[PDB]
């Protein structure tokens with residue numbers, strides 16, 4: 070049982086917390102499994118909805134993960150890497166604004182490099198209702214944090230926008246930015262953003278990043 | 285000593301065959317080291333000059349490598365993956381036609397996925413004198429061979445063009461195609477090609493693919 074896809078095919082069709090056994094990882098891992106969207110079998114790698122969890126963290130916490138799979142959390146890059154190294158995964162991103170609208174972006178192929186490659190992101194095949202173009206750079210960006218300046222900018226994107234992300238310079242997204250209750254009509258530019266959906270100044274209400282095998 | 289870059293910095297400035305010790309590989313590996321081009325320190329992952337070596341091979345030979353580092357060879361995907369997983373590498377490709385002209389393409393970032401990811405290629409930052417656009421797909425293609433149909437085509441690119449490559453459908457290159465002596469004015473489309481340098485019907489005289497750390 071390497072992922073929520075496995076969990077699903079073994080007959081567990083209810084979304085919720087499961088434990089999975091990831092190849093090459095020393096200990097099992099608790100994750101949230103979304104079994105509802107588009108046939109289910111999704112492993113959630115990040116979730117936000119209320120701002121209870123602080124995302125202003127360093128490289129090591131972003132690597133190992135933080136938060137609680139039952140609420141807001143970040144799975145951790147080391148884990149995302151280990152899972153997406155086992156086979157070929159697709160990535161889906163669920164987004165909601167503060168006005169009741171839900172949208173998604175989806176990528177046919179997703180993986181990231183290992184820690185020595187700064188967990189560099191490579192994607193292909195963007196579709197969805199959250200913008201005609203991808204708000205995540207497809208073409209290559211390392212992961213960056215306040216203590217690891219790996220972006221494609223002369224500036225320091227993590228310092229400017231907060232959180233850990235595959236910043237470009239700094240690029241059209243950051244789902245790990247500041248949670249703002251007043252996302253809609255008020256600031257700022259360091260919030261939870263997805264440019265091609267709601268723009269650079271709109272901070273979103275909830276996000277879920279989740280992955281599953283090509284099939 | 286993980287690569288020819290290490291070899292070079294230890295004072296070995298003469299191009300030729302060296303043995304390197306790649307992290308996570310059970311046995312040492314002989315490679316050709318190019319210490320001449322642009323400051324040296326290049327590890328050669330493929331070389332062709334005379335057509336003496338047959339490149340029409342299956343997945344396993346492409347994975348483990350074939351040929352002799354002193355002549356024409358393919359390092360092997362498992363090895364390319366192991367090396368490029370150690371640290372961030374750039375890729376440079378040296379090309380010569382049959383009319384005396386040499387050119388190169390260069391990529392700021394290079395790596396490939398693991399075997400379970402079909403050694404998928406991801407590149408960024410193409411420069412050089414071998415075409416204004418990259419003849420290798422940057423955006424994502426698995427590696428394909430006659431016995432592993434992983435390309436982005438409905439057709440079978442490896443069967444049509446021969447060899448093992450990151451075929452698209454089938455894309456603007458194949459440095460592992462048929463070696464033709466009569467490449468300039470004669471066939472064929474299944475030759476050693478780099479579209480943005482010489483075109484799809486021109487088979488090249490020599491090729492060298494080589495890698496080195498960003499520094």
Ligand SMILES: [Ca+2]
Nearest residue numbers: 222223224225
């Ligand atoms: Ca920077």
Ligand SMILES: [Ca+2]
Nearest residue numbers: 437438439440
């Ligand atoms: Ca095909």
